[model samples]
Target chain A: MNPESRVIRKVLALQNDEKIFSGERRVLIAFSGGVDSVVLTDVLLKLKNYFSLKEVALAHFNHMLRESAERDEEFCKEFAKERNMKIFVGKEDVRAFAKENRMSLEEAGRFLRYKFLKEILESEGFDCIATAHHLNDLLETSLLFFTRGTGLDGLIGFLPKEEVIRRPLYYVKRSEIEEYAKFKGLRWVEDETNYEVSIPRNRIRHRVIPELKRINENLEDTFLKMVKVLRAEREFLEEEAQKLYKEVKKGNCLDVKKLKEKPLALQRRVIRKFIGEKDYEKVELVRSLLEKGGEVNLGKGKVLKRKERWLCFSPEV
Target chain B: MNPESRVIRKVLALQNDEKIFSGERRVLIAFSGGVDSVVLTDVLLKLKNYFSLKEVALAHFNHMLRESAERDEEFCKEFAKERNMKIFVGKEDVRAFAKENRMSLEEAGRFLRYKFLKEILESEGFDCIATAHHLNDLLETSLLFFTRGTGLDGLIGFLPKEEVIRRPLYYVKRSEIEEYAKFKGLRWVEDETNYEVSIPRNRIRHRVIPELKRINENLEDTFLKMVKVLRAEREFLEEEAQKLYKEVKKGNCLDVKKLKEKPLALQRRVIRKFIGEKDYEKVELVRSLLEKGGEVNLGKGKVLKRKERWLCFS
Candidate 1:
């Protein structure tokens, strides 16, 4: 089988294995008009019949960060028109939004895009949102997380299936997608920012990964194996952590004695999940709740108090 | 405080925190007459009284690879004599051993060196053996494992204490050690091979770490934090894996039903520990035992057979 056909078959096999289309027919593709999304859209359209998928629509979010923003939207509109499929286009001033929210451009753009996607999914009653993130993106994100010093969840990278969002091409590679697009005579506009080294992810993509490839030529294959092991381990840990959280949790309060009995690995995550934040200071605050009956102000009108046996968190009224 | 004094105090604090020298009096330093070991020896000798340590000794293993091997041994002897400390020295033909064992020189050298160190520790009845593996070594090894792709255990890098072996300088940086050595006017021979890119470890130190540093300036600090987290997680996983092993294990046999109930993370490790090997194929063989009743020869008169309700290893 050719590379593209194998990827398409792989996606179909995954969907079949996971029973993704069960009780669902409407799907939304987060189309970027890039090679990854182009291949993803083509494969999904081709295999829609086999999966019994109905009402497939394309959604694009324009960040207005580039000169070709409208051009990319037009390209997506034309592509969707050619297929006679529904297309949803949303535009936002991502720079201004980032400044208002005190976040980076990348963070702002992602938040806006996902927010737009979710709005469309809810309003139009789409069951699943398919993304174009593949193996290379996974590898890059894993490396980025490692360099930035993260825990097990960060190392697991991304999930193939998470709630309404589905990454059908999770197991596929960027090279394979490019090959498929070329063989199918599909066209995509390259994002010039991808080549700019000012971006941390771009630096990782252009420099770090190639340097790592020198050490092991089969870097991607090695990472895939690592991902499998880590993902399984991470799932197991999350399951265990959730069990612990349920055991100790009581409304907005947790039993200090029960929380203290669990391992530190689980304790940190439990506190992180309870606080709705992964900040180390909050984790430490939750830990301090166990020693003595004291209260700590967790900012934003949120306060955690140790009351002899229970650690309580009171959010803004 | 100055850098040297701060490092000295840090070492002393770690020793106190870990209760490193509590068990017995006699301790052996695996001194190689290098900068790291020189700084380690100097600090330990100065702080020996503070830890209430007595009967400290220096041990050296000569690989006889370089022409200056004898000179290095002489340097160790002179240094030990100056301190009036007992010294243990051993020599091994690492090149011949590597050829005989069908291994690389590096592997042979490390194996022989550790073997000699353990022998000395046993014969002399020392409570602990201290080695000079520091932060840079840990960073290099972890990066090497990452490039080669490893699990949580591999990413945890090195342990501060294993068996009777202790690494007091594990948290100290290479630059700090160099600064301490120079500040104390300590003289030591430089291992010329450290600069040679032909060595995989040297290549990582020379090439890979610098590249990673370009991404994050405090790469070592970030790795130290990661190590602390991963080590704790690794310990937790190992405990869980061990529990699963105990549950399924029936003497030499393992109940395949109980084994199959575990997550793959635990199953893989349980099978690995049961088989005494890390081969994925062997793990798969153990997993296959759950399906049917059959026997597969595992070489060397060992066989894993799937019996009624149990995957028995004979």
Candidate 2:
């Protein structure tokens, strides 16, 4: 088979292997009018019968971070119209929202986009919100998390499907997606900004990746294998961590004696889950109470205390 | 307390926390007379009473890669004499040996140095071969392994004590070691080469690290936490994989049906162990037999095949 047909079939075969969406009809594609989403739209539209779908609507979120985003929104609407598929578009001033919330620019866009898309899914009753994050994003994001402060979760996250969202391009690489676009004679807009439309990520993707590629040419393939193994281990860990969490957890408070002797992997995972944040330093703060035997102010009215044997948390009333 | 005194106490405290050495000790210090090794030598001598009765010796490997190597060896000899410690030295042409062995320059030197030290350990009867690998080396090596192709093992491989090898400076950072050396009035040599004494690693330590530090200055601290968590998980996984391997292995061959249903994490670990090589591609090549039901060439006259439901290898 040609590269185009193989990738198409690969994505089609994905549904049989893993069910991202319920077999019942309505799906919302997070359309960016980029190569990734364009292929996602095309592939899903082409393989509609195989997926057992009745309707797949395109949802585009305009961040208003650029003048180009309006063009992207219009393009997405036009593209959806041409396919005879319904299009949903939402606009948000992401720069202002980001400053107000004090979140990263990319994270701000992600939050607003996901919020908007999720709102569409809930109101219009879509089974799944299919996203266009492929393996490269997974690799970049994994590296990003590792370079910055992160827990094990950050490195091994970005699943093919999670809750109402699905990443159809999870297994596919960037080069593969680009190839499929051209092979199918599809057109997509390019941004004259940071590679991912962000700063550090752009440097990571554009600069650091090439440097890594020098070390290993098949970097993505190796990364994919690592991810698979890590994810499986993570899967196993979560199952074990949950069981232990239940045993040690006395209502809201955890028994320190019961928790401490368990694996540090399981301990940290439980601590993160219990404290309601995946921040590395935050978990360590909670962890220190195990050794130091004192109360820790976890910011935003949250306080975790190691009182006698029980590790407990309470919101400041 | 000063950073120097605090760091010294931290290293001193590490021994109480972790038993990297035996009580009645003949510890071989892998001395380059650099700041790391200098502090290690000083700290061990200082804390010898706490660690109990001991004969501590310095072993230096001259990698003969530069003109300055002989100077380093002479400097190390004088340093050892000044401290009134026993000194042993070995020399080798590392660049030539690297070409001969088809290994990296650093690996070639490491192998030669480790081989020399291990020989000393076995023949001369030393309790431990204490090396001066601190947290920076750990960070650099972790980044190196991650950037290069690696299994989970690579990222979490460094231990405070492993077999006869002990890293006394495991908790100490490069900066802390430097500070400790100055505060204690110790002299050490400097490398005129790559920041690590190698190339890609130098870039990672010097270039990529700063970029990352800009993102989070407590990069190493965060990494240490991650490593601890990952190592614990790895420990748990290995134990589980070992148990599963015993069940699936029928003498030389493994039952495919028994292995396939288990977790992929466990499956990959077993495959790597069974294959004798821990290469990711090699494991996957063997893994393909689970689904494809065919034979695969594993190089060096080694072949693996799925015969019936058995992943039989020869």
Candidate 3:
């Protein structure tokens, strides 16, 4: 095979074992016209015949955060048009949305973009949204979660597949995307604000990740290895936790003896499942009931009472 | 009680629930005479009577990485003597050790220091070794591990208690340690090389940690919370893995049907134990045997064979 063909080849190989993009599925690409998404666009076009894709189109959200935002949006539209694909161009005052939701511009932009993508998915009858998230993005997400005190599962960070989202480019790197784009002579516009450090994500990219690269030059590769292993461990534990929830729960009550019999790791999950909660001290308070029986208030007249060897959950009206 | 007493009081509160030092324990302090260990020394002095300590003493290892190494050692000795306590001082050419063992200066210093401390621990009738590892240190360790692709267990970083080492200051911050040290009017030598960002730990402290601090100002406190929960989970999983190891192991063979019944996380651990190996693809190769039964080479002369329903370690 030619060197230029290897990028899509690798992308196809990822999907062979993935089975996520298989079948006659309609995929709406989250086209940003950046190198990442451009590469994804090229890959999905190839996979169209490979997976027997029913229909493939492009969805682009103009954040209007940048002055040249619509130019990029138009570029995406033309890019899709050139490939004989339909495109959806959506725009909103991201600054207003950020103020309304009290979210960072980055956060608000992502929220509105995904919202637009998902709306198009259902209304336009697409099966799932394909994102251009790659290895470096996953690394950035992991570092963000690590610094922000996120849970172990969060630390494993961005994955290739989610229910409504499909990331065919998850395992690829930005360099590879660029190489493929350059080889295919693809044109894409850059967002100027990406260099601005005011955004937390940009600071991570410009400052923290650089130092991290200094610490370990092959950081993304090592992270890719570790995250894959950790994700498996995480998925398996979650599966086990859910199974435990079923075994230990008896209607609104949980068997204290059975809960105690499980590991502390699984015990918290069972408690969380029973209480419809997560990581809250209230679930821990519910966990406390397992020790010789007790009672604690969940919230808003919700009460968890430990009666002998069983924990009964009762919410007062 | 004065304002100075609050530091020791907070230190005491940490041990109220931690029975690690309770009831007639002999502790050997890993004193470096830095602010961290100095505060630890003062805290241990107070804990002396609280735990009804059988014996308490200080052990200092001069890593020879510093030019003022002997001065720090004497300060520790004179400080301990003035308090009517004994201090044992040890030294080694950390430069030579680093090159010989292919370790960084930091790594060599830690290894030699702990080796000396543990030596005193066994010979000097001490039950355990106590060190001054604080919350910020734990955060630094977590970042290093995070960037270095460490396992989930490594990211939890540090703890107050280990098998032979105890870190009473694990939950306390560097600022708190400094406050306590200054309040006591204590004297300690500073290792000048701490400012050198060449060291990996120092790079984390000066460069990466500052960026992290900006990301979350209450970094250490948040890390303390996360680390505590994670450590419990890690410890529980490890204990569970050990139990699974016991359950699945039948001499040199494992019941494939029984092994297949366990979760992948636990199953990996069981394979690790059955093979006396960890994280080798050979163990994963062994896992492949669960499907139909096969054979793989463990190493030179070592082999693993799967027989039908039983993953007989033949």
Candidate 4:
């Protein structure tokens, strides 16, 4: 089979498996005029008739930091016009926003992009939003989390489907995207900053990932399986924690003795759920109320104190 | 503080925290004549008198493959002799055993060493057996498991204390051990094979660990925290799984409906605990009994059968 056919089969297979790009719902594609989004657009456009897709449109958020930002926006507009599809275009000063908010450039860009896509979804009455996040992106984010000493939940970073946003090309590799684009003779605008090592993701792409691949060429496959298990396990744990929390909780107060009856794992989760934060020190401080009668400040004008047998967190009067 | 004082404080701090070398019990150290075990021996000997330690002896298992194996044996003997401590010497043909058993050289060597150590423990009425496993070894093994894709239990590879076996140096890093040895001007025999890349552990030591350290220079400390959390979480999971197993299980048979009612994490663990194997495929095979009425071989003479309402394993 040709590379184009392979890409088509792969995308269709994943879509069918995930039940993506189906029903009579309006869909909005977060297109960046990149190879990934370009391939996604082409595939979804072809399968739109089969899936009975209604009103497929493109949503592009141009981060006005690059010199070729205008060209990319023009490309997206032309592509949408040629395909006879409506487009939603938004521009943001990523640099100024990032500096003002004291956030990383990547974080600011992602925030603005998602904000734009959600607004378009809400205003245009789109049923679902799609992104071009693929297997490579998933693995890269997982690697980033692993390097930062994250927990199991962090390691199980991105899901293919989260709420209304869907990633139909999540299981497809970046190489496959490039291959499909080349086969289809598709044109894309390259973001030159992608090559710059000043970004953490770029450093991971160029160095850490390649070194890991050397250790195990099938690292991506192994990691995918690991994340699957972790996600399921985490889901189970969360459910159990919720059950425990409900059992010992009474309104805004928790029965300290009942909470102490559970294991440390459950105890920690229950405290975090009760306090609405993941701070270990604060959790332990609240936990101390079990053995003694003490009142401690939990910030946000909230104070946790032992009232009889109940550990109550109430606003300071 | 000077390096010598630093090493002394670190060893003493760990000893006090762990209550190492305490009580009047027969203790056997798995002395390898390496830097790790040498520093361990030195510290224990220094604290033996203070802790009222009794009959502290050296047990060495020579995997007589390399030419310097005899030299290491000699060093252990002399070190024990100089301290007037009794020593047990055992030798094994690891290469031959590995070939015969279809196991790797490292596996064969470990098996024979532990076999010898346990025998001494039982025969000589020893209360505890100590090995020089440190933070570096723990991190290396955890990394190996991580590379191969493992669960939470795999990440919590080794414990400081397990049954009769204890690792006093489990909290100490390899660098600290080397520094302690240098400070004490300790003499030890080096195995040439340690530097060779024929072993997986050596590959991890030479390649994977260095790369990870470059990513975060405090990787060892970070990994220690990770392992600590994993161990606690695993322990909690095990307890919960045991509770679930007890609730639904009946005489090697688990109630299919009751088992299915539990979460997948608890379900998986209970199945694993029931089958006495960590293989996911086997666990899933048993899990299939929940929905179907069938019988399948679980290797050995073991069989899993869905006997009406009960999933029975015998």
Q: CA lDDT of B230 in candidate 3?
A: 73
Q: Taking chain A by itself, what TM-score does each prediction score?
A: 0.88, 0.90, 0.89, 0.89
Candidate 4 displacement at residue A119 in angstroms: 2.3
Choose the strongest candidate by TM-score: 3
- Residue by residue across B1-314, what tens digits does model 2's lDDT show? 88667776767656766776656478899998788999889988887777773788899999998778989899999999999988889888899999999998889999999888888877888888888888888888887787775656777758888887788788788888888888889998786665751387787777677667766678887787677678778888898889999999878888899888887878887887888877767787898788788899986889988888898875
DockQ of each: 0.56, 0.52, 0.54, 0.36
Q: What range of 10 consecutive residues in model 1 chain A has the weakest lDDT sum?
A: A15-24
Q: Order candidates by DockQ, high to low.
A: 1, 3, 2, 4
What are the clash counts of all predictions, listed in order? 0, 0, 0, 0
Encode model 3's per-residue lDDT on B1-314: one tens digit a residue. 64356666656656774665865478889988888888888888777877788777899999876778878888999989987777988899999999999998878988998889888888888888888988888888888877776666678876677788888887678887787777778888785878678776788898887887787887777677667667766776678788887677777788787878887777877887777765536677888888855788876567788877667655
Indicate the worst ten consecutive residues by lDDT in candidate 4 chain A.
A143-152
- For A133-192, candidate 4 gives per-residue lDDT tens digits of 887788777656555555566667788777888887777777888888999898887746
Look at candidate 1 and give me any clashing residue pairs. none
Scanning candidate 4 chain B in windows of ten residues, the lowest lDDT window is: B2-11
CAPRI class of candidate 3: medium
Tens-digit per-residue lDDT, A1-317, candidate 1? 88777688668766764565665688899999888888888888887887678878999999898888889999999998988989999999998887598888888999999999999999999988989988788888887777777777787888888888888887787788888999989888685645675676677777677767777877776777777677777777788889999989998888888888788778877887887777556676778777667888776777888887888875547
For B1-314, candidate 1 gives per-residue lDDT tens digits of 77688778768766875666676577799989899888888877887888788778889999899889899999999889988888999899998999999989888988998889889989998878888888889888887777687788667787777778777787788888998888878889787778686666777788667766777887777777777767766777788989999988879878788877777778877877887766455666766777766877774677788887887777
True contacts kept of each: 0.58, 0.52, 0.58, 0.28
Q: What TM-score does candidate 2 reach?
A: 0.89
lDDT of 4: 0.78
